[PDB]
Design a protein around this ligand. Structure first.
Ligand SMILES: O=C(O)c1cc2ccccc2o1
Ligand SMILES: O=C(O)c1cc2ccccc2o1
Ligand SMILES: COc1ccc2[nH]ccc2c1
Ligand SMILES: COc1ccc2[nH]ccc2c1
Lengths: 288, 272
């Protein structure tokens, strides 16, 4: 155990340090909450922190680590926004008590050796053109879960496929953690919070409202059935200047090998210039 | 509510949740939870793992019995003073089928991974799951399956698992044959010839004062003196199964087929 000053932000880089402090805290009866992040924190991340904070007796651990294993070449890894000064300041302001900021060397001292192989869901949607992306995500999350051993781990719904795959990891490896999905935080016009929003110029920012407009239109059209919901979303996206749709799919809530019934999830990914944006929404078919 | 647990008796659980709940409750009372994973059909090798686990002060011993895709086994464990047997069904372990799995590093494609390219992914997946269900302080494996032991140490290091891996020296028959459930399948000619695996390895370990090549040559000579022993490999590696260093500690591993029965053995080697 290194030092832990309660009511203050404690930053640990060494996996051993945060593991020691976490273990000590849990033994004195605190419930450890984990919010895994890649930094560049926005209000979406702060909603996760606040949800964690609400759990009685909680101590909140926010990890910040840009994980090289979930990026493919070139390219993307070097381009990910890094603003540690802002991040830690936001955490102090939220009364978070632990930030965990490991090095690449500490996380991957043996490179990529044992890794997590996701189920078939990882090959679809976001995984289609990026066949190793979710192996990278699940490997890092497993490691963070083992280092920190939290009672609960918090993820946004914005990256819905990621959230589902993390629930699969937790179930499939019998991890003793509760996965908490938090509803997507949105700008006033509906745009989903994302660290990628900073790459939209004023015009693209304006056009980008079409993703959330298309989704909310579909959710309401859905009383009239799946075809109507999908066609409403498509119509809104088609009305949008220089939104280039990658996919728009209505799936079961688990995204998996089961047909859509009364409850589903509508997912969209689209490019605005070079910026790729995701959003999704709960859909009830035939329900007003 | 924590499931029933009677100290000093064999408590048998089939539900992962029950053993998970009991192990957590026990660990909170100042017991150190020891895990001995097995595939049942227990022999003296497995009992050596149990005995090693038992001698840890404050230990409660969990033996899992699961065939990765009985009453005799439980009596043996009872006779050893083991307090928890974990006997899950396949459906209990894989309620959602094979979905998320462990992908081993490149060592898994070598040696035993030649004939069985996906064997170790299966093993590491089930071992990770048992570690997560039981959350033992220490987990015990025989050295006989050395490559498996090394891959488990890589699993533990790579995924930041909070468990100590304990390798237990191989239990042997009187003539040196490494214990294995497969031994019973050997006819008398085969069982007599099978002694060449251990004899080759012990000869190598002693020849090793004269260097790496002398050790390998001594082992090959011994295997060459046996009939009906088809050697699949004979390899000297470092202790982590990387390339052998020019001097220092290593491990010599052999695998051979006698009729339809594949046998394995390995030994510590000190070079020079
Ligand atoms: O900042 C994020 O959106 C984020 C961070 C993070 C860390 C591990 C796994 C998934 C993750 O998503
Ligand atoms: O009985 C054994 O030799 C045995 C059991 C077992 C269970 C999980 C992983 C490896 C294993 O080896
Ligand atoms: C809870 O609302 C959100 C929205 C977008 C997000 N991106 C990463 C986390 C996150 C959370
Ligand atoms: C401790 O010695 C041994 C020898 C052979 C074995 N087979 C399975 C476990 C085991 C243990």
């Amino acid at each position: 155990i290194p030092a832990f000053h309660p009511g203050e932000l404690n930053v640990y880089s060494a996996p051993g340090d945060v593991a020691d402090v976490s273990r000590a805290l849990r033994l004195t009866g605190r419930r450890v909450m984990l919010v895994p992040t890649m930094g560049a924190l926005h209000e979406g991340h702060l909603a996760l922190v606040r949800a964690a904070k609400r759990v009685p007796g909680s101590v909140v651990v926010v990890s910040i680590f840009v994980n090289p294993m979930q990026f493919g070449a070139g390219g993307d890894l070097d381009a990910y926004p890094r603003t540690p000064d802002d991040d830690l300041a936001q955490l102090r302001a939220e009364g978070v008590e632990i930030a965990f900021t490991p090095t690449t060397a500490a996380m991957y001292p043996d490179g990529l050796r044992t890794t997590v192989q996701p189920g078939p869901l990882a090959a679809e949607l976001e995984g289609g053109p990026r066949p190793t992306h979710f192996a990278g995500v699940l490997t890092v999350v497993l490691k963070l879960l083992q280092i920190v051993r939290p009672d609960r781990v918090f993820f946004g719904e914005k990256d819905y496929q990621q959230l589902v795959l993390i629930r699969q990891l937790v179930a499939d490896f019998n991890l003793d953690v509760a996965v908490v999905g938090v509803p997507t935080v949105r700008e006033a016009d509906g745009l989903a919070m994302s660290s990628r929003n900073r790459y939209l110029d004023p015009a693209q920012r304006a056009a980008a409202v079409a993703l959330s407009a298309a989704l909310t239109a579909a959710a309401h059209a859905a009383t009239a059935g799946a075809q109507a919901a999908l066609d409403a979303a498509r119509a809104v996206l088609d009305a949008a200047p220089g939104v280039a749709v990658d996919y728009l799919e209505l799936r079961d809530i688990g995204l998996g090998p089961m047909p859509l019934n009364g409850s589903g999830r509508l997912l969209v990914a689209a490019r605005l210039g070079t910026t790729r944006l995701l959003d999704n929404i709960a859909i009830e078919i035939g329900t007003f």
